[PDB]
Amino acid sequence: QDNSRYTHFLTQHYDAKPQGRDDRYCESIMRRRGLTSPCKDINTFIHGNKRSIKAICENKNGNPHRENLRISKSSFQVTTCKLHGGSPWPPCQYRATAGFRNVVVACENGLPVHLDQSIFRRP
């Protein structure tokens, strides 16, 4: 894996070519990524090419804020999957919300290792 912490990031938040941006896509990608046991309440996926994301961890497309938290310059195609159900246990049901917005990530060694999920709660 490419710098584990960064690879962990890509596994949880990156889908180059979504091929679906609906409830069905969410239910499916969450499972394939292993964020379903237990059900992860909220997860946002960034689409497009990786280089664009990397860049955020610099000043070509990124821009500082707080705890190594950079709010990207450019906007990204994203899909946020939100848990919609009665219990915290699987099977996990997700409602998908597609958007085109800038992301906020934490950078370490010039690589994104954390996605701030808060901004994706309410639009």
């Binding site: 499972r31 992860k40 309440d41 705890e67 159900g85 915290p88």
Partner: protein, 460 residues
Amino acid sequence: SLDIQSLDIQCEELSDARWAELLPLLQQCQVVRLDDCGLTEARCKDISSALRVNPALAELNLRSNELGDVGVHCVLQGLQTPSCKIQKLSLQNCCLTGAGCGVLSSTLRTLPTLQELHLSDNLLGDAGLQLLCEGLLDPQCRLEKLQLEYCSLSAASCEPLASVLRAKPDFKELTVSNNDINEAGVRVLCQGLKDSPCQLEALKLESCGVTSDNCRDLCGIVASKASLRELALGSNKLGDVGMAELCPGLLHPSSRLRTLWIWECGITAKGCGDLCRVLRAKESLKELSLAGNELGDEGARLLCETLLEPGCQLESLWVKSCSFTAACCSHFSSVLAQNRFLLELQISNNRLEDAGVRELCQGLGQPGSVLRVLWLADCDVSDSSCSSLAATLLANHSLRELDLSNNCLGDAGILQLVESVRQPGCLLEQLVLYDIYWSEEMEDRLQALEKDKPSLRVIS
């Protein structure tokens, strides 16, 4: 004597090389699950042929593969053989359509061993279901459990379903969540259930257009079906009125309902009060989901009073996003120190802050406390509560799973937790920390933990 083999592959495409080795297993496993494996109508022939010579097949699960009407027709042909003993079949999300229900109808008629069928997430529509009910109505069909979520059904499908129910006394579960059957359909379905002699055990009508009126209907099913153990009605605009309408049946002495799901049903503290009359009178109710209802601290208040009274033996309570604030924590703290039945409490997505959490921690840290799972995700927790949580983890001996996801906890707060959890005297087995930022070092220490103490899973 015995030779039981099981194959269960999930989210990973095989490849003709891997697929080649797997084929002969398909001939000997009693349980076969190929979930989301990129199976194509092409490999369905291998499956069919291998399943034909499989004398032990009891369960077949092919969920999330693009089989289509023809692909399914193909696999089902490997099952129409005088030696097949299949008991459970899932074709969930397999690109099946109304036209694929013909094959399904025949199979059903010629397989009396099959008791459970999962057809959720396939656009069958009313036309498809109608065809399906023809095999279901066959006297040779012994199906007792049917799941039809996200099947594109309308109120039109309720008449045929009601007729199957009225005719099969050994029917146990009907799940029709996420289909817009609405008030008309729900009422018909109910008529079928009341007239039916079936000892239904589980009925799920989540996001089905259920209304308050339907509640008088449901009240009847609940009051009379003594076999009923699970009723899921989440995501239906039932309201406090529907609540009041439903309660009388739950209190019926014959009812032994164990699980009730009424999340996001638009219930406020008022219907909560009605609900509480039930909780304090029925020791049979073990699980209750009230997530997504604006109950407020007034609602938490009522709940907590009930949880501290005799008669209430609720084991799991899910109250995620119920509009609770730090103010209700003093009451929850009392339940956690006193109550000896509640083992699972989900209070995530409630603004309890470090204040409320410190108090919850008080009650939990008491002797005799029995809580096993606590979800405090997104609860406005900071590095501030991590000292009280760290201590509680050592004071308390019942917790086995803790969820602190999405909390502005920091490197500082995490350290404190890593400190107690390392202890051999801490018996926690799972700690969920999703979406929480921590440095490479904290990260390091976390992987230390995972290696030193293998009995504990640290999630993300």
